[PDB]
Amino acid sequence: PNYKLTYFNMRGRAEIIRYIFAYLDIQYEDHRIEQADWPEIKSTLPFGKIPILEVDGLTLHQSLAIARYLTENTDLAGNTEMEQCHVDAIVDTLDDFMSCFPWAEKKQDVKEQMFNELLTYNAPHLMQDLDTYLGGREWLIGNSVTWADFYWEICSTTLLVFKPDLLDNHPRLVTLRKKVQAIPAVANWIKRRPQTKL
Amino acid sequence: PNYKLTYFNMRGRAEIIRYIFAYLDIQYEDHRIEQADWPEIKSTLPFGKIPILEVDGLTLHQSLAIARYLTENTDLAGNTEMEQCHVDAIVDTLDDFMSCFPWAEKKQDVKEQMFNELLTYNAPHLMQDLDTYLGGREWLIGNSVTWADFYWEICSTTLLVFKPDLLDNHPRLVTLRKKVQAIPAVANWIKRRPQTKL
Ligand SMILES: COc1cccc(-c2ccc(C(=O)NC3CCN(CC(F)(F)F)CC3)cn2)c1
Ligand SMILES: N[C@@H](CCC(=O)N[C@@H](CS)C(=O)NCC(=O)O)C(=O)O
Ligand SMILES: [Mg+2]
């Protein structure tokens, strides 16, 4: 069973796949491309977008669809059909925000303006809604860790790059961030992975 | 279970759920609202976004996460993990494009411009990709209809209001809509459902 992950040299939307792998102890090759190799590959893929996962000469796309596939009947999945939902909902609420950023804007000031808006106007509200949804439970979904707990910590990672005082009023979020990061197989990948801004 | 789905009087985000309910033949409370009682409601919601589904007072959110949850252990789900990964991928790719529209934009002309240019440049790029992902095959994924075909006809239905000629060069994509529409339960729902623009 053969794994070639394709994406740019960034955590980005691949990091949810790379946390899963290294958690669930599975060998993959981590194929990281140059911004200038991209069009040559972009042309050949059915949907022109990455990440993508090749699974013995089979081509998968859409990080979360993939993420959801590598966790169907595993302990990062929800212990029940309802908890699979909340997981997917939690993930999509975060992707919904993360997906808002003009990541690929080449006009810098125009980009910075848009990033700053969202990080002051929309961010704290998302953090709020999250903390409350967490309330006082140990994980986001049910009684153990799930990949939604991973998406969160990953999304939170990149947001923290751009606005450090973000979780100041949410220790229960810094707690959760940190409790996800201290997991053996997670903790170790965080130590080894390439060191990219994004 | 007792299902209560809450949304506006329209299709938009809730429709994928309504289709699934009809196909699956699941009795459910289809509660629609006018703005009038919106922030009155919005308050009582973990994430203050709709559609939402109450399943015995247990509230669930994210339209796709819910639709998925509702297709779990049916055939609508895709017939194999691998397919289900594809069905998800298409649903996201579809949802990704849709979330690119300024839906609530009240400067009518900025709407028009972006809308028309999104159909101009973005939309036909996704059409060829969908067209050629579909091929001459019957359904988008697998040997049988999955909830990704449902979403295609729901999405393409709404975008066709704004650009009728949208699919005038993708015979095969109009083919897929008709195969979705002629499904008895869906065709029943179609004629039953109330008349709204979107
Ligand atoms: C992990 O937390 C998330 C969740 C969702 C999205 C992202 C995310 C998305 C995009 C990027 C990003 O920076 N993508 C770039 C956009 C610019 N392109 C330039 C291109 F397309 F020309 F190659 C490279 C990929 C980073 N993180 C991160
Ligand atoms: N919903 C998609 C978003 C995928 C996406 O558009 N990825 C970006 C990189 S972050 C991309 O391929 N952009 C470069 C391009 O447009 O070709 C997913 O979850 O994978
Ligand atoms: Mg999405």
Distance CA A1, CA A3 (A): 7
E strand or H helix at A30: strand A29-33
Distance CA A127, CA A130 (A): 5
Matching residue, tokens 């704004």 = B162
Distance CA A118, CA A124 (A): 9
E strand or H helix at B177: helix B171-182
Least Cα distance to B139 among B82, B83, B80, B94 occurs for B83
DSSP 8-state secondary structure symbol assigned to residue B170: -
| SS3 sequence of A3-18 | EEEEEECCCCCCHHHH
Strand arrangement of the beta sheet that strand A59-61 belongs to:
A29-33, A3-8, A52-55, A59-61
What domains can you pick out in chain B, each with its CATH number?
Answer: 1-74+183-198 (3.40.30.10), 75-182 (1.20.1050.10)
Helix, strand, or coil (residue A75): coil
Please report the sign of the dihedral spanned by the C-alpha atoms of residue B33, residue B36, residue B41, residue B47. Answer: positive
Matching residue, tokens 């923290």 = A160
What residues does A52 pair with on adjacent strands?
Answer: A6, A61
A13 close to ligand 2 (CB < 6 Angstrom): yes
DSSP 8-state secondary structure symbol assigned to residue B77: T
Q: And the tokens for B145?
A: 């209809």
Distance CA A25, CA B177 (A): 42
**What was the resolution (in A) of this experimentally determined structure?**
2.1
E strand or H helix at B60: strand B58-61
Least Cα distance to A17 among A64, A84, A81 occurs for A64
The residue length of chain A stands at 198
Between the two ends of chain A, the Cα-to-Cα distance in Å is 29
Q: Solved how?
A: X-ray
- Given 3-state DSSP classes, what are the helix, strand and coil percentages for chain B, each rounded to the nearest 5? 55, 10, 35
Task: Give Cα A42 to chain centroid, integer Å.
Answer: 22
Residue among A50, A52, A64, A85 with most chain B CBs within 10 A, to mutate:
A85
Ligand 1 atom index nearest CA of A98: 5
Q: Would you tell me how many other CB atoms lie within 10 Å of the CB of residue A37?
A: 11
Least Cα distance to B98 among B121, B113, B84, B118 occurs for B118
Q: Who among B47, B66, B85 is closest to A65 (CB)?
A: B85
Helix, strand, or coil (residue A195): coil
Helical H segments across chain A, by residue range: 15-23, 38-42, 63-69, 81-98, 108-121, 123-134, 147-162, 171-181, 184-192
| B187/A contact by beta carbon, under 8 A | no
Task: Give Cα A17 to chain centroid, integer Å.
Answer: 8
Q: Is A69 one of the annotated binding-site residues?
A: no
What residues does A80 pair with on adjacent strands?
Answer: none
